[PDB]
Every structure is written in structure tokens, then in C-alpha cells.
Amino acid sequence: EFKTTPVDAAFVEKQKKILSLFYNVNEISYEAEYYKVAQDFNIEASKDCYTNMKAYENFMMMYKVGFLPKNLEFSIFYEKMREEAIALFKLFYYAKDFECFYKTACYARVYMNQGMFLYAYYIAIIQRSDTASFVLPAPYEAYPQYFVNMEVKNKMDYVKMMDGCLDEKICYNYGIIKENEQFVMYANYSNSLTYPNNEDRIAYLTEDVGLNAYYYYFHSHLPFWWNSGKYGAFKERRGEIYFFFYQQLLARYYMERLTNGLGKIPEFSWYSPLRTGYLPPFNSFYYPFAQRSNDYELHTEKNYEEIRFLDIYEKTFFQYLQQGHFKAFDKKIDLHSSKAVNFVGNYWQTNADLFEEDFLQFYQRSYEVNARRVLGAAPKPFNQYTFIPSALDFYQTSARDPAFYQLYKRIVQYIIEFKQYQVPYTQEALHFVGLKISDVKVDKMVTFFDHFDFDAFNTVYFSKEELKSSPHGYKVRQPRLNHKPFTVTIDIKSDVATNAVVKMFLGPKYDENGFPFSLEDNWMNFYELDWFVQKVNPGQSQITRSSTDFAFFKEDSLPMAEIYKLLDQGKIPTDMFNSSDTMPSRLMLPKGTYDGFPFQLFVFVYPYEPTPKESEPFKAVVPDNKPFGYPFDRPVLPQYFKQPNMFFKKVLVYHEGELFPYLFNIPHYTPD
Amino acid sequence: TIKTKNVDAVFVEKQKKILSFFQDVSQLNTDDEYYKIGKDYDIEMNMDNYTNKKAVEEFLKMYRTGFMPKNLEFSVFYDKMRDEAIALFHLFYYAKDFETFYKTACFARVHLNQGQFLYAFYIAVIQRSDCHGFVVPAPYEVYPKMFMNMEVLQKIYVTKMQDGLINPEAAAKYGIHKENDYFVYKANYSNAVLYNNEEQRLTYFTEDIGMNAYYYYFHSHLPFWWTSEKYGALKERRGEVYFYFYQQLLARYYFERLTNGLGKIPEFSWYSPIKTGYYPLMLTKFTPFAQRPDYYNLHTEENYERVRFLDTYEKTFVQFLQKDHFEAFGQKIDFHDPKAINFVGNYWQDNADLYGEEVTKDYQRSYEVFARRVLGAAPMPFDKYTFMPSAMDFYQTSLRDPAFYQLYNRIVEYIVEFKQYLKPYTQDKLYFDGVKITDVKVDKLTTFFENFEFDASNSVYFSKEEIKNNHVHDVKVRQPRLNHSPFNVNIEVDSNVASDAVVKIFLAPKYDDNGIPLTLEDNWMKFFELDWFTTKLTAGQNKIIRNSNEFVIFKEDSVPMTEIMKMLDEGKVPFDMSEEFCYMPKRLMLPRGTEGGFPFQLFVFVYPFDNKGKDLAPFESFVLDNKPLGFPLDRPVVDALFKVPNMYFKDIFIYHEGERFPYKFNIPS
Numbered sequence A: 001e002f003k004t005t006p007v008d009a010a011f012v013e014k015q016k017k018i019l020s021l022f023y024n025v026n027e028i029s030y031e032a033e034y035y036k037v038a039q040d041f042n043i044e045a046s047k048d049c050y051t052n053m054k055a056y057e058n059f060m061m062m063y064k065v066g067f068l069p070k071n072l073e074f075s076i077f078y079e080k081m082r083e084e085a086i087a088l089f090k091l092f093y094y095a096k097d098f099e100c101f102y103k104t105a106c107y108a109r110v111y112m113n114q115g116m117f118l119y120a121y122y123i124a125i126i127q128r129s130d131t132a133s134f135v136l137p138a139p140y141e142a143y144p145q146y147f148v149n150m151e152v153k154n155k156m157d158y159v160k161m162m163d164g165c166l167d168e169k170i171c172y173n174y175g176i177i178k179e180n181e182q183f184v185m186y187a188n189y190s191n192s193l194t195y196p197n198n199e200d201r202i203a204y205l206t207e208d209v210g211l212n213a214y215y216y217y218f219h220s221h222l223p224f225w226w227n228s229g230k231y232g233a234f235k236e237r238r239g240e241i242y243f244f245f246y247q248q249l250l251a252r253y254y255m256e257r258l259t260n261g262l263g264k265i266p267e268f269s270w271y272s273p274l275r276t277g278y279l280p281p282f283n284s285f286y287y288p289f290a291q292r293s294n295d296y297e298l299h300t301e302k303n304y305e306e307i308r309f310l311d312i313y314e315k316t317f318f319q320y321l322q323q324g325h326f327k328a329f330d331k332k333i334d335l336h337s338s339k340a341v342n343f344v345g346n347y348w349q350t351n352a353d354l355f356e357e358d359f360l361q362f363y364q365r366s367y368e369v370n371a372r373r374v375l376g377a378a379p380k381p382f383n384q385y386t387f388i389p390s391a392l393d394f395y396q397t398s399a400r401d402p403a404f405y406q407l408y409k410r411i412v413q414y415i416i417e418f419k420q421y422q423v424p425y426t427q428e429a430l431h432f433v434g435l436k437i438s439d440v441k442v443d444k445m446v447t448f449f450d451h452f453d454f455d456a457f458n459t460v461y462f463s464k465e466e467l468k469s470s471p472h473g474y475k476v477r478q479p480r481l482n483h484k485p486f487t488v489t490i491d492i493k494s495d496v497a498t499n500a501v502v503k504m505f506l507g508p509k510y511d512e513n514g515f516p517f518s519l520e521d522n523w524m525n526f527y528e529l530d531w532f533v534q535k536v537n538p539g540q541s542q543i544t545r546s547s548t549d550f551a552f553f554k555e556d557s558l559p560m561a562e563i564y565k566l567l568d569q570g571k572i573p574t575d576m577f578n579s580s581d582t583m584p585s586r587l588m589l590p591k592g593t594y595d596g597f598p599f600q601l602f603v604f605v606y607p608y609e610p611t612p613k614e615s616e617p618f619k620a621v622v623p624d625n626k627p628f629g630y631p632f633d634r635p636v637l638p639q640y641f642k643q644p645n646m647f648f649k650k651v652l653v654y655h656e657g658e659l660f661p662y663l664f665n666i667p668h669y670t671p672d
Numbered sequence B: 001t002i003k004t005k006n007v008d009a010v011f012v013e014k015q016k017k018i019l020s021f022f023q024d025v026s027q028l029n030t031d032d033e034y035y036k037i038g039k040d041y042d043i044e045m046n047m048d049n050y051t052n053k054k055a056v057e058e059f060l061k062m063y064r065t066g067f068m069p070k071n072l073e074f075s076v077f078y079d080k081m082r083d084e085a086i087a088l089f090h091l092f093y094y095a096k097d098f099e100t101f102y103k104t105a106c107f108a109r110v111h112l113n114q115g116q117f118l119y120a121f122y123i124a125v126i127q128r129s130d131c132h133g134f135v136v137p138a139p140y141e142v143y144p145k146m147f148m149n150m151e152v153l154q155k156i157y158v159t160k161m162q163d164g165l166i167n168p169e170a171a172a173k174y175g176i177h178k179e180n181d182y183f184v185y186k187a188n189y190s191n192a193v194l195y196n197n198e199e200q201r202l203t204y205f206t207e208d209i210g211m212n213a214y215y216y217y218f219h220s221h222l223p224f225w226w227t228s229e230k231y232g233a234l235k236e237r238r239g240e241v242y243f244y245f246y247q248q249l250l251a252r253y254y255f256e257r258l259t260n261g262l263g264k265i266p267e268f269s270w271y272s273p274i275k276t277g278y279y280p281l282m283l284t285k286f287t288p289f290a291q292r293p294d295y296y297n298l299h300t301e302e303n304y305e306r307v308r309f310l311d312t313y314e315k316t317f318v319q320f321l322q323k324d325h326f327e328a329f330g331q332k333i334d335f336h337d338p339k340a341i342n343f344v345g346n347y348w349q350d351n352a353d354l355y356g357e358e359v360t361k362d363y364q365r366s367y368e369v370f371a372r373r374v375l376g377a378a379p380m381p382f383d384k385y386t387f388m389p390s391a392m393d394f395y396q397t398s399l400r401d402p403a404f405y406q407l408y409n410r411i412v413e414y415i416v417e418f419k420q421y422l423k424p425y426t427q428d429k430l431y432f433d434g435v436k437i438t439d440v441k442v443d444k445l446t447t448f449f450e451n452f453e454f455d456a457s458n459s460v461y462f463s464k465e466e467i468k469n470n471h472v473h474d475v476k477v478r479q480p481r482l483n484h485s486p487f488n489v490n491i492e493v494d495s496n497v498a499s500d501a502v503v504k505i506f507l508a509p510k511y512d513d514n515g516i517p518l519t520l521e522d523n524w525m526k527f528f529e530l531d532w533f534t535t536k537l538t539a540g541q542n543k544i545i546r547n548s549n550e551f552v553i554f555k556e557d558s559v560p561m562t563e564i565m566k567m568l569d570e571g572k573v574p575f576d577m578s579e580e581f582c583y584m585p586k587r588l589m590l591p592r593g594t595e596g597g598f599p600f601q602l603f604v605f606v607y608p609f610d611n612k613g614k615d616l617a618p619f620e621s622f623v624l625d626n627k628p629l630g631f632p633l634d635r636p637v638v639d640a641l642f643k644v645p646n647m648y649f650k651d652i653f654i655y656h657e658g659e660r661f662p663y664k665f666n667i668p669s
């Protein structure tokens, strides 16, 4: 009951090579294969490992100067850095074949900044079409310092310096135990000291490792600085998925807020104090992460120039809308087409497609980068290779900061302002003639917390001796949200014999007040649970769909220990290779309440139009003509949403066992 | 020991007529023939005597409506006043020949406001081709009230009211002495009575009479409101000239900051308070200059509409940056093109060339103007001719106000933003085949303060009696000013093949505030050009000696008019006043050192002098080169793609000798 895929022996060899660069990423083992291979890799004499001569020579130019030194923090949001990671990726991506890529990576694993190496390496593995099917470690196993609060990281460093536990009893009381000769450290989510306000209610979501990893995978599947020509016809839809990704994520987040009684995502101004502070429980080699207080004044001497830029970046968009048709980055933008939809997203992300070039150029300033800089609260960088980090400097920690959700809310509002220019769906575009949903039934929907382990060994240091055998076994254990399986049953009268699409969303039923949401105001608050095609036949029939089969959710990634165990059996975990960029399903449902929190499930059935065969960047691109998020991709006329083939069903989400995650990490106490 | 030049009969006569207009400037000598000419001079009747029929007629329409009254204070930053100045300028500028020009000035001296007249006349003498090579007095001799504090002014008034000294030994205690037939007044900088913040540390530079004269000349040489058609190939480089003047100045200013322990010019916001106040000790015949208190809220009620304009002006530029290529003001513009500096500079200046027109118009609001006005903290002008002056209403006073440096720093930074779109120079563009600088040595560099006197008589009103006997020149101001010893730069160069070469010398700081060595990457706009010249290299090894006294970019102290009247009787003219008048003064080349030797660096660059391709000699004898202003540091640098054998960075230290503080020169007993 963990999805398997069989896999042959040539595969095992290549997968083992790729996985091996992730062992002890923070130090160098002189007797690892990678070290020998890098010693033996003559880079000057290797023009013929590369499909692209320019990339090679471009790398050598920067190479001869020198790169970002080992041990410094890496972030693509600083330019000098970005130009280097991009050079590294071009090398990885234009390597003739696998041998070539492996020597290049070994070299980089040895001689280059570990952050930069891991960033380029992940992206290249996802992007190279000969590596497309290989599995990667979960990002929290590759960069545990981005996923572990200081408290836990310190406890582990402490256990290491002592070479183990003084005595068991002392240790157990501090949440430190041995299991099968490995160390396990119980971890709480952070308290009122890092989230000095109500946002702490939600720390179990915002600090969730799955949810942070998801954002990282999203970025690495199509990074802003890269064009999307690798993906064919998807190029003309890149901006669409940008909106969708953020609209869905914020919809997921607002639902968490509702169950924890927290109301709307706050709005703000660049010219005003921002309310919800955040003190990141992280440090880099030199600096504690930058802290932002409650009521932090965004508008100060240090951010004035940035704020001017941000301000006119948004107001330009207003000017576009005001005008309908306008000259923008080559063509005339007409707001009534869908070349408009694409433009809108590329505009807000300042991605490579906006400029219709291959890679983001050195002088093109991004809206999102400057926003993160203002909101990150950090002091200005010490030099081009040394910045003071904040949660917003990385996709791995971004979702920990309340400001992150506020910033994307603002962008999503802006896009929704443009979406006011889109013609709404008519009766005839949504009516499925000859078919009616007569009823929807759902099993009990139940959430709970349960423990979850990962190996954090990459954040622990090891002697020359211990390294000779790839040492690990430093596990973090944490209560994480989860739900039970449940089945949706859909009942249908049908005249016709066609293939059909069934979509299901979850959205709010009541606002923070107690009033029924009205669709005109709530369509942006629905997130997709599922999509699939079904043969329908006339009469009454019924489709059953288990939550374990929902399209947009995955199983927890396996740890590397387990990946290797499986490899020795010719086995690969499906969800880790066929769909890493997908939301973990443990977070499928907001945390419920013991009585049951009211949400609603929208079930929509429409005719299926045979759409060709692609191989797009994400799981969110289903083989359909339909816009992403359809029929909730755009403003609603409510009288058109009483279609026989639509059905809004009230459902309560329960919760069972302890309502608070800390109750799982108390020494002489066991929960429920 | 003042660089001379010889001169003929016709020259001296004209030059005397020209200098006649700068003495006793605020009064009229009934008996002087300039007056007899002036009173009766008929413009209508003389229409055939001007190159431009419509300029005469335009002037005439305005003159009947009415020009600004006399004694009222003149500033070009106000519509009506400026319009009258331009109408007057045109008339001077389109006079057929000298006689006509001379007479038109006579009329204008007699009939029109003093400041308006001198403003227009000064510019006219600089712009008229038949006038090229003539000499004008120093701005400080013409407008003395603007180059000195109240205390001094008032001592001058008191002495004049008493017709001398009631008690010479008492007057002595106040720094007032009779030296033969002169009254000499010692003057402190303002910090000697006012230390209302750390900016007052810099008064020996910001209040310096030469520096302030320097800005005035720069304005006059090519005022913002006029096209540069006259200067030919500089028309296509005007924005570049505007950026570079300001870039060089702020580097120079910054140097002064570093040596008094002050660091970066602070950023500001039209929507927030601005830190440092400005409390001017200048008087105007009619009013005090306006103060800005510390923490002054730039966004108060009177300023709402002003700030909306200024914020939009800026935001429109930020829009340009965001879209790379665009159409504005009738021009397709590409920010990838280095030539785009021309537009960038022209836009920030709202000059006539921005619009491809000869003169700017009222509806074309300037950013500089309204920025000046808001930061000047004045109340609303009472009407078209009655305003409360602040330092920034005049070119002769601007450098006094720390806010001025904040305002142009901001402008320069936006141009630097544009400059980020330019690709950095590669090795090949900079590398000088077979040429290597092997050593550089420099004589000791010492700064020091030294007394300087200027004729301040125009600040004073003489009696009918005194005007007739010509007793109009007995008031001098003595003041300690910055200076430095002359120094040689010894450069040793190697080259395979003999070749014609260009040598450039720059000054830049060694460390930031934290004491980390400067990367070129962050700091290429903090380099200040000292000199360029050409030499001929030979096969083998070369020794190049260059003295500070011969740097092309700086001038000598100008001579007082009285001393020029003396020279004209001998057929001599002060060379640096004729053709180098708008250069920075030599004595201000170096920032004030420290007793220990403050750390700086010399950058020497040697490159091939191919031929004379693109060649500036109409405006400035500055750029006889195809090369950007401030080449090779006119754009971003990558340290490792940049350094080549024909470059040398030498560490140097600037020392200071003698009295540290100007006021120690002004003590009695």
C-alpha cells in the first residue's frame, strides 16, 4: 500500500550515482567515488562533453575568475549568484549524455558552493529529458537546515559533539531517543516567540515540511529565469498556471485560517506599517536570519528606491487595464483574448517568457524579488556574495512567513482585476445537455495528527573516519497533519453515451461572520481536489472516487534509506518520480473540529474533448482544452451555476485525537 | 606669476566697455556715457540692427506690458522672470555686431532690473561668437551679497554708514582694517557661529567662493532653457555632459565627506521628513533667505500638488527602465544603446533639447525647478515677482545647501540605473597591445588653508560724489580658502612599438566607511578625473612626468577687475579667465587631508590615441576623443574583466598642514 513501479538493472546503477551526490552534502569525503571522478575530470579539456559551445565557454570565463565560495548562503534572488547557478545549469543541461552529466556534477559537488550545486543539480535532473524519470530525495533531506527549527538543529549538534547520549533518561526527557541505533529528535512547531501573533495558530501548516517542499518542487519544475520552449504548446499557457498555482495555494491557506478562526488574508501598503511580524528560527554561517517585528514600517530610508520601483510596477498594470489595448514588450496586448491571460502571469512574475528570451538577463529587475527584499526586513547585503538571509530568500522557507501569503494575495487580486475584463461563461458553455447529477454522498472526512520522520543527517558533521561509510541516522520526528481515506459517490441521470470529465473542488461555506458565501465572491476560494475521465451510459448510474486516487495529491516521499532498500528489489516509488510537484495528500483537508467544520464540495461533470499527447511541466496540466481551474478560473454569474450537471454539497470536516500538535511530544504522556 | 596673454587696441576698448557693466552694478552714473546712450536708445527704430526680426518684436510686446521692477530679487526658476530674461537675452544675442550689442546693454542697464540684466548680459558675453575670448569678472565680484554671510555684510554697511572707522583699534577686534585706501573684512565660514548638525563640518567646501562660482559658470555656459544647436556635435551629447558634471561634483563632495568622517549622502522621500536642515545667514535687500528646519515634512499641505508632479516625473523614468525600448517625446529610444544617455540626461534636466526646440516653454514643467522649490522650504510666492528666496533659487548659492547634494545624488543614481543596461567593457576594448605601466610615484600631497581676498564693493551703495570721483572700489573680503602644494605624477610605461597614446588620471577613495578596500564593481562612479593628455611612446621604456599645475581640468584663481584694468593698460589679459573660466579651481583639486595622511588612490589608464574621430571643441576643449565622458569608467565594471597591463592603481595619502580650522585664521590681538 505504497505505490510501486518496477525498474531494471541499468536503472539502478544510474539512480545510485545520482543519489550518491546527496550524501553528506556539507562536507567532502576523499574516498567517495565522486571525489575521484572530480579529481580525474579535466574541465579545460572537455569541450566535447557539451552540446552547446557557448555554455561551455561561458562557464570557463566565470570559472577562471571564480565562484561563490563554499559555506556561504545561496539564493537565486541575488544577481551575481543567479548568473552563476544558471551557468552551472547550462553545463548540466547540455551534457551529451549521462556520463558527462555525472562527471560535471561530481566536479561541482566537490569544488562548488553546496547550495548552488544542489539548486542546479535538482533542476537539471528534473529538466534533462534523459533524467526525467529518476527519483530525487525530498528537499528536507537535502537541505535540512531549511526545515528544522534551531532548537532541534542544536539538540542534534549537541548529541553529535558528545558522540551520543550521556544517559538515556536525561535524553528522553529532552525528546531524544535511540531506535535501531539511530537518533530520533521530537520537534514542536514554533511558538509565540517566532510568530508573535495569531498566525501562530497556523504554524503546523506554515512550517509543514511537505508544504515547504511542494513550493520548492514547483519552482524547480519551471524556474522563472528559464523560458518554457522545452514544453511546446504549454508555453502559450505559462502565465495561466502561475495564477492558478497561487490562487489554489491561497485558497488552501484561507481554509486553514477559517478553521482556526482567523479571517481574511490581510492587505497592506508599501507606505504603511505591516502588522504581522515573524522571527525566522534559522541561521546561516554568519547571520541569524533577519527578523521583522509587528508593525514594521516598510517605508524607510533603506527601501525607498525599492518601493518606488514596486509602486510603478503595479500602477503600470492599472494603466494597461485602464486602456484595454496597449503596446507591451513587442506586440499589442488585447485584453479580450487569452494571449492576454498568458501575458498577465508572465508580467507579474517577470519570467523569461515576458521578454521572449531564453534566460532572464542581468539587468531585468523583478517585481517579486524586490517585494521579498522589502518584506524580508534584512539589512542590505555586505557584498555580492554575502547577503543577510530571510525566510523569503528561499523557496524552501518562503511559506513559513505570513508576509509571503500576503504578497501573493496582492498579486492574485491584481490579476483578478484584469479578469474582470474576461467574458463570463454562459448557460450553454457550462450546461451538459442530457445529464444531471442527482446526489453526492461522502464518507466521514476526518483529520488527525500523527508522527512523521525524516533523516536530518545532512545538517550534522562527521569525522574523516565516519564519512568513509556515508553516515546518517539523525532523524527528526514531528506531528504532521493527515486525514483518513474517504470515498465520494456521485449519482447521475444521463440520456447520452459519452466520456465525461468529473471535477471536484473544496471551498468555504460560511465566512468568518456566519453568512453563506455567495459564488460571485467565493469562486477564487475553491481548490481542486480531483479530475478524471469516465465512460457514462444512459439511465441512472453512479461513479465512485476514493481520496487515495485524487489526481492532485501524492503520498509522502520515502527517505533515501528506503529508496536504496527499494532499489535492491528493482522497485521505484511511483509518486516520487511520476508526480513530485504535487501537494502531499496529508494536507488535503484543513484541520477540522470535533463537531465538524462546514465546507462545501463542488462537483462538476462536463463533456470530454479528446486533446492530444504532450509531456508538460506539472501534474496540474490535465489533457484538456479547458482553462486551468475551469469553471472557477474567472468571475461568476451566479444564476448560471444551477446547472443540472453541477452540485454543491455541504460537508463537515471532523478532527480526531489531540487537537494540538504539542500534545504528541510531551515526555511521560501519550495522546488521544 | 599669473598666466598672461597679449592683446591689441580694438580689444582693450571693447573689453573696457564690457567691464564697465560690472562695477557699481546697483546704481547709475548719470555722467557716464553708457547712461547717455542708454536713456535715449530706441529699439523700434533700430530693428534693422538685429539678425532676428521676431526677437525684437517679442521683446517689444513684453516691454510695453512691463518688465520686473528694479531692486526686486531675480531668479530664473520662475516663469515670468525667466521669460523676460530670455526675451532680453535674445535681443543681446541677435544684435548684428558689437556696437549694437553694446548699446542694447546700455539701454538695458538703465531701464531694467539689475539681476535680470546681469544674468542676461553675462550669458550673452559667453555665447556671442564675436565675444569669444573676452573676459568676465568672477561671479563673487559681481554678486558679492550671495557669497558672504550677514555678519560680514553688516560690518560693511556699518563702516560705510560711518564713512570709516570711529575706533580703528575697536574695528580691529572685529576683523576690520584699513590697508592704504581699502577696507578689508575678515570672514569666517558659518560654522563659526552655527553648528546645528554635522554637515557644518563641510563649510570650507560648500561655502567656498570658487566652488559656488564654478556652478554659476556651468549654468551660464549652457543654460537649461536653451538649445545647444550653437555647439554643434555636443547637441547629441548634451545629456552625457549633464550627467558627468553632476557625477564629478558629487564624487568631489563625497571625498570631502570621507575626510571629515561622514560617509554616504542620505536618500530621501517626497513623502517623509528630511533630516538635515539648512539655516542660511544670507540677506536679500528685501528679505531673509528661507530656513528648513531639521526633520522638515516635505509632504505638507502647500506641497501636495508639487509632490504629485515630482513623484510622477520620477515614476515615469522608472517606467522607462522597466520597458527597455519605448517611444517618448517623439523619439524611439533604446536603453541598450549607450547613446541613450543623451535622452536620459535631457529628460532629467527638462532642457530645450528634450523637445528639439530653441527655448523651453512654461507648460513644460521642470523637475529640477519644483524639486528645488519644495526642498527650499519657502512659503508660496506672494506673486510673479515677489518670492522668499532660498539657497536653491540661485546658481550662486545652491552648493550651500546639503539638500542640493541629496537632490542631485538621487538624479545621478537614476542615471546609474539606466547605465546598468550597458554591457561592461571586455578585456579587448581596454587592452593596449604591448603596453604596460610598470610604476607610478607621486610627490607628497598636502592641503592647507590660505587667505584670499575679493572685491566686495558691489554690495555697497556709493554717494553721487563718490560715483563721480570714481571712488567705488574700497571694500575687500579676506577669507581662508583650501589650497594644496603642486605635485608631480611620475609614470613609467613599457611598449614594443612606438605609438600615439592617451593618458588619463583619476582620483578615488581607498576604503569604504568600514575600512574594506573598494571594488570597482560598486564604486566606479566615485572616481574623479584629474587629467588627460596625449604623449608619444617609443620602443623600450618611457618616463612621463606630469605636474598638477598643468592638469587640463582645473583653472587658476581669477583676477580682480581692478587688476584687469591695470593689465589692459599693458595689453595683457588673464589667460584662465578667457578660455578656462568654467573649470574647477586648482586650489580645490584635493579634498582636505588629515594630519596622518588620509588614504586614497590614483588610477592611471593609458590607451591608444588612434586619430581625431569624434572631436569636441565647440563647448569644451574636453573630449577630443570618440570616447564616453569618464571612459573607461562610464558604466559598470567587472573587476576581473577590467584590469589590464596598461592600468595602474597607486595607493596615496592626502596630508594636511598648518592650521586645521579656517577660523583660526580670523582671530584678533
Ligand SMILES: *[C@@H]1O[C@H](CO)[C@@H](O[C@@H]2O[C@H](CO)[C@@H](O[C@@H]3O[C@H](CO[C@H]4O[C@H](CO[C@H]5O[C@H](CO)[C@@H](O)[C@H](O)[C@@H]5O)[C@@H](O)[C@H](O)[C@@H]4O)[C@@H](O)[C@H](O[C@H]4O[C@H](CO)[C@@H](O)[C@H](O)[C@@H]4O)[C@@H]3O)[C@H](O)[C@H]2NC(C)=O)[C@H](O)[C@H]1NC(C)=O
Residues within 6 Å of the ligand: B066, B067, B068, B069, B070
Ligand atoms: C505698500 O503696499 C502696497 C500694496 O502692495 C504697494 O502698493 C502698490 O504700489 C505700487 C507702487 O510701487 C503700485 O504700482 C504702480 O501702479 C500705478 C497704477 O497702477 C495701475 O495703472 C497702470 C497705469 O495705467 C493706468 O492708465 C489709465 C490712467 O489714465 C487708467 O485708465 C487705468 O486705470 C490705469 O490705472 C496699469 O498699467 C496697471 O495695470 C495698474 O492697474 C502705475 O502707474 C505704476 O506703474 C509704473 O511703475 C512700474 C514699476 O515696475 C513700471 O513698470 C511702469 O513703467 C510704470 O512707470 C506703478 O507700478 C501698485 O499699484 C500698488 N498696488 C496696489 C494693490 O495698490 C505700496 O507700494 C507699498 N508701499 C510701500 C512704501 O512699500
